[PDB]
């Protein structure tokens, strides 16, 4: 019983970087997605694999909230079957994803004069990420034929890069907060249902 605690995920003071995206398990509560939709003015609210009309009537074993911060024009990469730096090295969704992606502009919170360098993203990687994979490795990336031996030289790049979010920029470069809800339905008592 009792409403699902979405507050600590969406209203949270701090959000993680895209390469270290945060995950939260939600269960044993009733989810009212109309209240969540009308709780604020979101920029994107798109549900994949499930009809939004039939949302307050379903039941699932669990739900998982993945929260992070990206830039505007990268929001297109948070979707099944998308490519790009974020969709390959930071956060990956399966082709058969079932859930809902929500995103909203956060320039008033994640933009500082001179840029915000606290937010990073992975730039180089040897292989793509599997769906729902989280990589926090900081090993030196080998670019050339010479071995790196964990020394920051040339052809030996650090795999993470700063965003530098700045307020006066256009909305394409402005920081956006992204929360992805994934629905898990197993042979188990469904602990999340509509009203």
């Amino acid at each position: 019983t009792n409403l699902c605690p979405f507050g600590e995920v969406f209203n949270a003071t701090r959000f993680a970087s895209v390469y270290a995206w945060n995950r939260k398990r939600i269960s044993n509560c009733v989810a009212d997605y109309s209240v969540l939709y009308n709780s604020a003015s979101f920029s994107t609210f798109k549900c994949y694999g499930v009809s939004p009309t039939k949302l307050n009537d379903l039941c699932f074993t669990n739900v998982y909230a993945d929260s992070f911060v990206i830039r505007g024009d990268e929001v297109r990469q948070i979707a099944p079957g998308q490519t790009g730096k974020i969709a390959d090295y930071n956060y990956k969704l399966p082709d058969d994803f079932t859930g809902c992606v929500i995103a909203w502009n956060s320039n008033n919170l994640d933009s500082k004069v001179g840029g915000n360098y606290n937010y990073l993203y992975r730039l180089f990687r040897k292989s793509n990420l599997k769906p729902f994979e989280r990589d926090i490795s900081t090993e030196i990336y080998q670019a050339g034929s010479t071995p790196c031996n964990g020394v920051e030289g040339f052809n030996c790049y650090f795999p993470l890069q700063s965003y530098g979010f700045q307020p006066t920029n256009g909305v394409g470069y402005q920081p956006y907060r992204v929360v992805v809800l994934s629905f898990e339905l197993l042979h188990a008592p469904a602990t999340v249902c509509g009203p």
Epitope: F45, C47, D73, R76, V171
Partner: antibody
Framework: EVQLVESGGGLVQPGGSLRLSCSAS????????INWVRQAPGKGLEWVGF??????????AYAESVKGRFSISRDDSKNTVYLQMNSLKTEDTAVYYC???????????????????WGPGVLVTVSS | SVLTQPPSASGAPGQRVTISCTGS?????????VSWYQQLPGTAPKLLIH???KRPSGVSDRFSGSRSGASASLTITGLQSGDEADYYC??????????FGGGTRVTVLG
Amino acid sequence: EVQLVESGGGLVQPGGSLRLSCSASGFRFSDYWINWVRQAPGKGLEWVGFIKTKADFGTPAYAESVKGRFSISRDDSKNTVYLQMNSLKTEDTAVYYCTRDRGILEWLIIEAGWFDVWGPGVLVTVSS
Amino acid sequence: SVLTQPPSASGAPGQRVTISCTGSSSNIGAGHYVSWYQQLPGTAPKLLIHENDKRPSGVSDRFSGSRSGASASLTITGLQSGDEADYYCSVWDRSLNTLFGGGTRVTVLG
């Protein structure tokens, strides 16, 4: 030839009702947001309303001058967006245009978007 | 909020004409990419500029767009007698949704 065509206009009495239909031709009609924009005779362009797609959580949003009187719906099986007008006033006499929203398709954020395809327009005259 | 546009913009044949669109900090001062559309006498509007800078294919390259602070500028180089039309600018706002400008009537001075 990608097309959008509106139909169902003409002369209506003050207080009457009328339904305009906008039909598409040559593209994925279920993937685009649809906007209705009107223009009074000899005046500027005024946004009337918009409707999202099936997989988008939300309801159509209207203008404050027509909120509670105009309704926007869609039928994907027939590729037609319907604009229903009830309790019509003489202020509603205008040319109505049906358009689609690209940029929302590519960037998926409300802050970025533009209209690329426009229909010829349909005249609605409210007089007695 | 109806973004303010000059009622007209004139120029001798071959000039460089500029049209300005002024908005609030809620729409043009917050990025919110601006769009520029053209309406010939008796026709439907046609998209000219999107994302304040980009030209769709087929649109002539004599049309340029820029954004500064809470204002936008559309520049037409090499003015032609065929460019005489009405021009509108459209932006999204957090409260009032889509807004259009007052319209600028371009005249080639004879």
